[PDB]
Amino acid sequence: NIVTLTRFVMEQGRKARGTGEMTQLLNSLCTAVKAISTAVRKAGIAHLYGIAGKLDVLSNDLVINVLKSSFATCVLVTEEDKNAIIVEPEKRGKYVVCFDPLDGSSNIDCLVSIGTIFGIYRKNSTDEPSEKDALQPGRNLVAAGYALYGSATMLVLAMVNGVNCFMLDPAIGEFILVDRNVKIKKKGSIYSINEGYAKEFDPAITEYIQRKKFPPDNSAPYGARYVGSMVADVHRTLVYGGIFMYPANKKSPKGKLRLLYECNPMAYVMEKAGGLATTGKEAVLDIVPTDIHQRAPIILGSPEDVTELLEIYQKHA
Template sequence: MSAGPFSKRDFGQNLGKVLDAIAQAVQDIAVLLRSSSCGETGTSNTFGDKQLEVDIRADEFIFERLQESNAVATASSEERPEEIPLGGQGFAVAFDPLDGSSIVTANFAVGAIFGVWPGDRLLNRTGSEQVAAAYAVFGPRTTLIVALPDPGGFAGQVVQEYALVEENGAVTWRLIRDDIHVGERKVFAPANLRAAAENTVYRDLVSQFIVDKYTLRYTGGFVPDVHHILTKGGGIFLNPVSPSAPAKLRLLFECAPLAFIVEAAGGASSDGRTSILQLAISSLDARTPISLGSKDEVKKSLRCLAN
């Protein structure tokens, strides 16, 4: 595996190798999305989601790269939701290989999500135990956003963005934004909007956003909607529920890693009662309502999430 942007940095315990494996897998998937069929396979994963050919191949690429790193003891994915031993030592990785595959055939931006925990297990952990998390955006550009230990030696995490670029005939990762922060902006992305038919608190909140002249930025993809918040410096993604529109986003594979990144950037996350990072991952299929983004905006969403 070729050296990536993280392997030469001293994170301790080979975390750089894991992050480089993720970066290489993202590069593999970027090529895959440009050149392969996005047709359905006729199969579904354990959760009942229809699988595309690119879902399965992206999943394979990531498992292969993680195993090659020799630094991953256990991995699990949304396509293969079981704790699979990979023979390495140091970390457990959970990932969604192609988040938003339902919109990939419309040629919308899609993503991949990764959470990295120390040790060899994922169950009965919390998101706060992650040592790093990342997501990739596959759009006009391929970018990788990473929350990782502060390379300056200070406490906490730093959030950085890398872009896949061609330099001197070679494809490489270039750091394009360092120390990303989430502030306050009047932008909203209302997911699971069908829940507003029964969840009147959610419906009232969306109406208030409109009255207050918030900007709507919603693609139908979790990753690009959260990425817009980090790119523009604020806003909120919210996914409340109702009796007939239950939670679909998975705590382990989607919510915990993205919450880790947003909170590392100075934002907030909640399920209506507590930070997403405090929720115990009691099963690989655990799901949760969620809001992510600017602290003040997340506070406004608490009642509709707990409804």
């Protein structure tokens, strides 16, 4: 018998004896993702083309409005907004949601996969809600995941008891559980990084990559993939195995990717799946942010591949 996201979430909220506030939040998210999927796939485009009678701004406006209306949130952090958004008291809940409404927006004109990333924290210090409420390490996440708008739309939800994948059936607007309790392969055979920045890579990265192309024990070199859209690259890593890297380089001395809404949610997802997520020096989830738009270096994926790189880092220290 089939399991829909709505049923699964509700069930999980029942086993946890929640008051149903988080459950409403997750149902709001799902509704928002479906709406974003529909806009991404271009339904109604004929209307802009005058059969007479933006995508990231709309996406932002959908997430914020849909999340507010859930009455389960108090603080919102968007990649798109400079300051955190404080929900009006009438609509307040106890949750802080950190999200990237549409990641990979550059890739839009090229029709490359894009996705939505979100991390959910529970408000701790019960003072008037504010930005500080979002400044929590990723180890403190209640839930995190992402929606990938690729050849099909998928929602990956990670919580304390594991990672689950839900495929969207757009005929009936419902997410079906298709992969339960996901676990990443211990060792993979694909490395993903933008080698265009080779000139700026630190030594450890340089050695690792070359070890991938020319393995000492003449084994098969790793295949390479780099879609340029984090959600797509990280999703392939989780599903097929391997390692994804967006280390520090001159243009981004602290990495390009943001900690709260890109790095943390993906780090959380990887850990629950049995993978590692490091900065090179430390675990991503343990870092305590000081700025909501803070950036951080990130390397994640199969435990053996990440460990192997971490050993190399240590060797140059």
